[PDB]
Amino acid sequence: APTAPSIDMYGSNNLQFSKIELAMETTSGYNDMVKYHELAKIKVKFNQWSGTSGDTYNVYFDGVKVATGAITGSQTTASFEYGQGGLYQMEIEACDATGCSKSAPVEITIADTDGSHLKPLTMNVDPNNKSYNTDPSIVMGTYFVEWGIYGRDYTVDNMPVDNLTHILYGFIPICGPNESVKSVGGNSFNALQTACRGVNDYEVVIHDPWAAYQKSFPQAGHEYSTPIKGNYAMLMALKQRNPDLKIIPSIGGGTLSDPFYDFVDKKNRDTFVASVKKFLKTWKFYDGVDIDWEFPGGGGAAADKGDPVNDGPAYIALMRELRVMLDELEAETGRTYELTSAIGVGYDKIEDVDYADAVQYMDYIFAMTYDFYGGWNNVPGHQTALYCGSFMRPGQCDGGGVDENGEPYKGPAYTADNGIQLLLAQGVPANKLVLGTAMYGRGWEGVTPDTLTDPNDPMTGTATGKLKGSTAQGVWEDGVIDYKGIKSFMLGANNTGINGFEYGYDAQAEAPWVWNRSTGELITFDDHRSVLAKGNYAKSLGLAGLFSWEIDADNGDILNAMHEGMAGGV
Ligand SMILES: CC(=O)CCCCn1c(=O)c2c(ncn2C)n(C)c1=O
Ligand SMILES: CC(=O)CCCCn1c(=O)c2c(ncn2C)n(C)c1=O
Ligand SMILES: CC(=O)CCCCn1c(=O)c2c(ncn2C)n(C)c1=O
Numbered sequence: 001a002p003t004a005p006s007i008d009m010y011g012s013n014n015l016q017f018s019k020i021e022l023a024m025e026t027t028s029g030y031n032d033m034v035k036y037h038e039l040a041k042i043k044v045k046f047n048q049w050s051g052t053s054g055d056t057y058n059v060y061f062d063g064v065k066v067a068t069g070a071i072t073g074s075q076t077t078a079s080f081e082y083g084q085g086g087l088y089q090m091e092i093e094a095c096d097a098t099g100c101s102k103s104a105p106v107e108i109t110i111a112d113t114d115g116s117h118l119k120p121l122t123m124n125v126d127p128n129n130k131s132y133n134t135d136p137s138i139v140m141g142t143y144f145v146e147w148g149i150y151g152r153d154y155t156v157d158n159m160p161v162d163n164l165t166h167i168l169y170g171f172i173p174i175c176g177p178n179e180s181v182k183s184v185g186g187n188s189f190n191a192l193q194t195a196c197r198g199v200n201d202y203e204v205v206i207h208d209p210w211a212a213y214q215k216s217f218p219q220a221g222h223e224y225s226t227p228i229k230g231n232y233a234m235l236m237a238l239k240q241r242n243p244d245l246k247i248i249p250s251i252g253g254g255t256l257s258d259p260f261y262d263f264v265d266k267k268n269r270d271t272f273v274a275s276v277k278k279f280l281k282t283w284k285f286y287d288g289v290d291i292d293w294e295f296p297g298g299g300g301a302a303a304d305k306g307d308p309v310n311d312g313p314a315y316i317a318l319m320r321e322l323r324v325m326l327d328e329l330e331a332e333t334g335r336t337y338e339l340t341s342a343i344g345v346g347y348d349k350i351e352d353v354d355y356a357d358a359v360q361y362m363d364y365i366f367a368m369t370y371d372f373y374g375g376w377n378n379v380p381g382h383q384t385a386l387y388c389g390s391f392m393r394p395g396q397c398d399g400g401g402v403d404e405n406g407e408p409y410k411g412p413a414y415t416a417d418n419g420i421q422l423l424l425a426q427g428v429p430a431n432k433l434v435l436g437t438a439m440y441g442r443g444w445e446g447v448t449p450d451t452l453t454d455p456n457d458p459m460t461g462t463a464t465g466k467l468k469g470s471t472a473q474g475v476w477e478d479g480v481i482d483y484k485g486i487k488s489f490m491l492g493a494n495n496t497g498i499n500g501f502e503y504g505y506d507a508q509a510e511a512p513w514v515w516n517r518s519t520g521e522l523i524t525f526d527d528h529r530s531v532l533a534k535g536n537y538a539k540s541l542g543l544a545g546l547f548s549w550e551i552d553a554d555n556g557d558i559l560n561a562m563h564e565g566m567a568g569g570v
Contacts, residue, residue: 002054002094004101005046005076012044018111018227019085020282024214029197030205036282039081040110042067046092046103047075054096061088061108085112111227114284115236121157123241124219128556129160132563136244139364139434139545140562141166143250145552146211146231151471154552156234157219161242163559168290168342168366169235170550172251172279174272176201176259180301184255202259202268203275204251236285246338247285251276252292254301260293261305264314273321280329280337288338288363289322295344297352312353316361323361342366342436345419347399347411356427366434366547367423369416369534373524374442375466375479380459382511383524384438386416386533389509391459415509416534420541430542435534437546437562439483439554441514441525443467448520458515458522459506467521474553482553486525490514495527505529528561535565 009015019040023033044059053074059067067080071094078092089105111117134140144167148154159167173181175196182189188207195205206212213230216222220237222229228236235247252260262268280286296315298306319339326337341358343349345367359365373381382389388397392413395401399412412418416435423433446464453460469475474485491514492498501514501521510533515522526534531546538546546562548554 001052001098002071002096002101003048003051005048005057005092005094005103007090007092007103007106008045008047009106014223014225015044015090015106015108016111016225016227017042017082017109019083020111020113020228022213022228023209024229027191027194027209029199030195031198033209034206034282036113039083040085042078042080042082042108042110044078044090044092044108045075046078048094049074052096054094054101056095058093058095058100060091060093060102082110085110085114085116087117109227112284113228113232113236113282115233115240118233118237118240120241121234121237122219123159123161124157125160126158126556128560129163130556130560130563132163132560132567134163134563134566136165138566139165139547140559140566141168141366141434141545141547142551142559143168143170143547143549145170145550146208148550148552149211149215149231151476152552155217155219156231156238159551160556160559161238161245163563164245165545166547167235167245167247168250168547169231169247169286170250171207171253171256171292172204172249173207173256174251174259175199175203175205176262178256178258180255180258183301188255200271202262202271204272204279232283232285239285246287248288248290248338248340249279249283249286250290250292250342252294254294257292257294257300258302258305260296261302261307261311263318264307264310266317269314269318269321273318273325276322277325277329287335288326288340290366291318291322291339291341293341295349295352297349299344299346299348308352315353316358319358319361338363340364340366342368345369345416345423346372346414347418347422350419350422350426351411354426355423359428359432362432364432364434364544365423365428367416367419367436368549369419369436370438370526370549371442372414375444375463378444378446378463378465380444380447380461380463380522381414381524382459382506382509382513383442384416384436384526384530385506385509385511386530386537387509388413388415388418389459389506389511391454391457391506417537420543424541431544434544434547435538437531437534437548437558438526439548439550439558441481441483441486441523442479443481443521443523444479446520447515447522449517451520457506458504458513461520461522463522464520467523481523481525483525483558484553484555486514486523487555487557490523510534526558528557531558531561532565532568535562535567536569539566539569
């Protein structure tokens with residue numbers, strides 16, 4: 001016989017609650033901005049403006065009692081905890097000695113990071129991505145980059161997810177020595193320093209919390225009160241649409257790998273593995289971890305780091321210790337968690353790790369069969385060829401010979417086949433290796449006809465510097481161009497060359513190029529033909545499948561060719 005409660009929607013945070021507490025309106029240290037709670041804190045204000053208030057309230061979710069407390073006037077705040085994410089029909093009843101009066105039901109949301117409070121994501125995929133019926137046991141992976149939501153304007157709902165088995169989310173940094181990030185310029189290092197305030201060295205953090213969980217995306221139905229927004233909320237709604245898709249955070253990458261060189265000290269590995277565990281308990285849409293250390297032994301961005309004696313065993317110990325940790329998580333959750341890694345495949349990178357040993361702990365190795373040549377020097381070559389190109393010298397392919405000054409080659413040339421064969425030769429099983437495809441070109445300026453030693457092969461020329469171009473043409477950094485930019489501005493609709501470019505294909509190497517004889521612009525990339533060759537190769541060897549770098553740079557053609565190449569290899 002009290003007055004039935006009316007719920008104050010605006011005074012109760014629009015009934016949006018969450019197991020994870022995320023700062024939405026600042027940028028600060030990771031432990032300050034993100035706190036995961038086993039019980040969500042619920043606070044609901046309700047009013048009984050007329051009649052009698054009564055003396056106690058009970059709260060029901062879908063008919064089940066979940067909280068009780070005292071009413072002592074005409075406005076009450078009910079505070080309680082609840083442990084399960086989801087949407088629920090909430091009623092609040094007020095009671096006195098004579099009876100109870102229940103409010104009308106209203107939906108309350110309790111967010112959790114598995115996306116259990118979210119409907120399947122609405123997609124907006126370019127229709128140039130076709131539908132395939134590829135065997136679901138073949139890996140078809142890609143990297144989605146966190147910063148792609150800015151100038152590249154490529155969001156989670158743009159991904160052709162039904163053509164993917166694995167989404168690797170690039171990248172999760174590690175607090176600590178990070179001079180390589182500083183050297184890149186822009187705001188990357190400053191962002192990282194902020195995220196690491198109050199964080200122990202060697203723990204993972206989110207690099208850009210605005211991209212990850214703050215930015216409101218209209219296409220995803222995000223509102224002011226939505227407790228999780230950003231790319232991560234969209235990946236959560238994506239797992240609701242595609243529950244079998246694996247979404248894996250990739251830790252490291254070329255500029256973020258500095259802290260891995262300190263993993264020869266086991267205390268640093270323990271700190272890092274513990275932070276990864278906490279990370280996967282906090283962000284439950286993720287299905288494992290991808291380790292992208294570029295590179296054990298050195299030769300990467302950090303010119304002053306790398307230990308060819310100790311980094312390999314440290315890498316193998318890291319994989320064992322991660323696998324132990326992921327086994328605990330599988331025990332706690334009943335889920336399967338995957339452990340993978342993207343690796344350099346030049347002989348000098350491979351030789352520093354016993355991968356046959358590492359790989360017993362791992363689900364897959366993503367072999368980085370690209371970046372073999374590029375604008376960091378003026379030597380043209382195929383950056384992603386399967387085999388040795390026509391431009392190579394006698395004995396260069398297998399490393400038997402000498403260069404143009406008579407210097408002996410130090411090892412086999414950089415090709416996908418050389419890398420894959422070296423890994424098989426170590427005893428890595430073919431069905432754990434995933435072959436990489438480039439959705440971008442690397443290129444040079446200045447490779448004009450007078451520099452060529454073979455007048456029909458620009459790979460025999462010499463450059464003056466890196467390819468220059470605008471972001472409109474898909475050039476986001478010097479020397480690098482999106483595949484969709486090469487297609488729009490160099491190849492044209494018929495793949496025969498526009499704007500002063502001509503198309504060529506080195507049939508020996510299985511590698512395409514476009515060349516502008518007058519500017520001497522030369523770009524090496526993967527196209528439909530070379531990606532079919534890769535698919536045939538992967539099929540021949542019984543590899544796990546294919547992956548690509550990076551999804552925002554494709555227009556559909558490369559991922560389509562990945563699927564066609566895997567079907568059609570003979
Ligand atoms: C600038 C900010 O808000 C957080 C840091 C983002 C990190 N980041 C990039 O922004 C980026 C990038 N490459 C190109 N860009 C534009 N990398 C490698 C990166 O880590
Ligand atoms: C502006 C920008 O993004 C340049 C990044 C180059 C950093 N970097 C590498 O990533 C790298 C490398 N060797 C292998 N890798 C993967 N070196 C020598 C490098 O500087
Ligand atoms: C196949 C393999 O082992 C590649 C090793 C890294 C290639 N590479 C560079 O050498 C490099 C670079 N930037 C500057 N440099 C000198 N990047 C981005 C790179 O990938």
